[PDB]
Structure 1
Amino acid sequence: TYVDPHEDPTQTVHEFAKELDATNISIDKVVGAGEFGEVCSGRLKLPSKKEISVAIKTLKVGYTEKQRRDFLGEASIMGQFDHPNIIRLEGVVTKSKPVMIVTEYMENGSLDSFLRKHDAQFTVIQLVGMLRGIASGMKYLSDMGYVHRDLAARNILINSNLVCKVSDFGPIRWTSPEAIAYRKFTSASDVWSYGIVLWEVMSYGERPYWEMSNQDVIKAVDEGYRLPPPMDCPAALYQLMLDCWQKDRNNRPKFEQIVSILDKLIRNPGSLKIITSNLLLD
């Protein structure tokens, strides 16, 4: 079970994050600005003397205590999870400044931007592998009782071997109608979001609902309209999207069911050969 850090939430950091010695951290490449400071990458020397690549984030000089709490809050959440499809927290540096969060290095970055660079260049089985990884991570998060609320291809990272991992543990296009309507956030609203991610992946990182007015995204979906099948989309995967986008949250599949559906498609790849701008009324 996941525990929400929220009455001295700062202690949650130490409970779920390793305090790293800066001696063991080196910076090789500055990526640029993040929400709370800089973002870069480098190397971490592990206690066994193994050396790994890592992503590193720093807290800006002259941070406010609120900024420090919000920044480190990411670690307090991420550190509770240990799963191959959830970004790994290597640790934090809090006993010296700048304060740091050190996480799993992912060579290929955010999934949406990666796919946009490679429009139509992967096989359907490669795409399904990416989607299965994401579903597996989400199955674990939901097993832990963690509702992500921000599941979207931009918040999935992809490594050198195309393994996809859920990130963003620190408005509208990815959110279920009930979560928009009255903040009803549940694992079933994450399943809705997963449906949107499935569409993003099969569309090679097209933006969900393009740049429709947000009020129209809300109204159209409420009226029963859904995103159209991506080009050359297997029927099985478009059906899976529609199932994730059921109006009644109780009728949506559970993440375990989504994983099993994709596993069956992986085992019987011939199933993917049945193939299915403007929204479609469903």
Structure 2
Amino acid sequence: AKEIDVSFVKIEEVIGAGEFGEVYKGRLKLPGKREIYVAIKTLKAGYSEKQRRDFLSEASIMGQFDHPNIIRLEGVVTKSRPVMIITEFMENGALDSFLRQNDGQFTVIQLVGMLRGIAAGMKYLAEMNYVHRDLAARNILVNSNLVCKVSDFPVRWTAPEAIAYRKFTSASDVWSYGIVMWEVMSFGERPYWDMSNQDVINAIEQDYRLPPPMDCPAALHQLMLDCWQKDRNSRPRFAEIVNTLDKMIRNPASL
């Protein structure tokens, strides 16, 4: 929880809106240090003390992590009003909109590298006994070098036992990850397209699973299907997902 003097922060244009408030692009210039771009997360005007505490709890969770595929907390502004959370800036924004605006414009190996980064971030979260519960391409951010990082600290992304019995675990996080794999390899198609939420639940219970996206390697779609096994203990763990994607990257004939 590093405290940042607000005079070191220059707020520029709005780049997003979340549950808490607007997110801005900005510049952070600490004394003696090279300026960097940041995202500045703000809290909607008029917030109460309880809303302030809930907002800053995002920063306290984020500050526990230090991994190249988890969004980095630069610091917080809490000595002055309004409160702000300052994170690293991700030039290409959310992964789902990034892919939908770049349909077809990345190679399979680039997309696999994106997925490997997301899986490494999730492995790290799971090792720290953090269950994300909301993993989806809209909650992954992408930087200028196409590195993907988990952020956000929804029936069609949720494992069936999390829907039916409220059992959320890292294995339900792996189900969601398989949906993210399908989002990525389809360049941001909507999972299950225009099916209703109840139609999705009923179909999954009768063993429907999403088909391979166009031009998706068979081995990548099989890994999706492994993430979507009904029995949560049959799903691969994130450590195995990373190893599988690494082997695909090392042996690209397998794609």
RMSD value, Cα: 1.1
2:129 matched to 1:126? Answer: no
- Is contact 1:79-1:88 (8 Å) kept? yes
Where do 5+ consecutive residues of structure 1 fail to align? 1-16, 273-282
Give the distance between the partners of 1:181 and 1:55, measured in 2 at CA: 37
Q: What's the counterpart of residue 244 of structure 1?
A: 227
- Using a 3 Å threshold, how does the CA distance of structure 1 residues 253 and 48 change in structure 2: closer, same or farther? farther
- Using a 3 Å threshold, how does the CA distance of structure 1 residues 49 and 120 change in structure 2: closer, same or farther? same
Letter in 2 for 1:126: Q
Where do 5+ consecutive residues of structure 2 fail to align? none
Give the distance between the partners of 2:15 and 2:226, measured in 1 at CA: 38
Instruction: Map residues 48-59 of structure 1 onto 2, 5 A cutoff.
Output: 48-59=32-43
2:201 matched to 1:218? Answer: yes
Q: SS state of the match for residue 23, structure 2?
A: strand
Q: What's the counterpart of residue 88 of structure 1?
A: 72
Letter in 2 for 1:188: A
Give the distance between the partners of 1:266 and 1:137, measured in 2 at CA: 17
TM-score scaled by length of structure 1: 0.88
2:228 matched to 1:227? Answer: no
Give the distance between the partners of 2:202 and 2:38, measured in 1 at CA: 43
Q: What's the counterpart of residue 209 of structure 1?
A: 192
Q: SS state of the match for residue 96, structure 1?
A: coil
Give the distance between the partners of 1:229 and 1:56, measured in 2 at CA: 38
Letter in 1 for 2:164: A
- Is contact 1:60-1:98 (8 Å) kept? no
Letter in 1 for 2:72: R
Letter in 1 for 2:226: D
Q: SS state of the match for residue 155, structure 2?
A: coil
Give the distance between the partners of 2:84 and 2:65, measured in 1 at CA: 19
Runs of 4+ in 1 over 6 A off after TM superposition: none
Q: What's the counterpart of residue 4 of structure 1?
A: none
Deviation at 1:22, TM superposition (A): 0.8
2:13 matched to 1:43? Answer: no
Deviation at 1:66, TM superposition (A): 2.5
1:103-160 Cα deviation digits (max 9, x unpaired): 0100000000010111111111000000000000001000100000001000000000
2:176 matched to 1:155? Answer: no
Give the distance between the partners of 2:18 and 2:182, measured in 1 at CA: 27
262-271 or 32-41: bigger deviation: 32-41
How many residues were matched structurally?
255
Q: SS state of the match for residue 173, structure 1?
A: helix
Q: SS state of the match for residue 147, structure 1?
A: coil
2:12 matched to 1:28? Answer: yes
Give the distance between the partners of 2:210 and 2:168, measured in 1 at CA: 21
Deviation at 1:65, TM superposition (A): 2.2
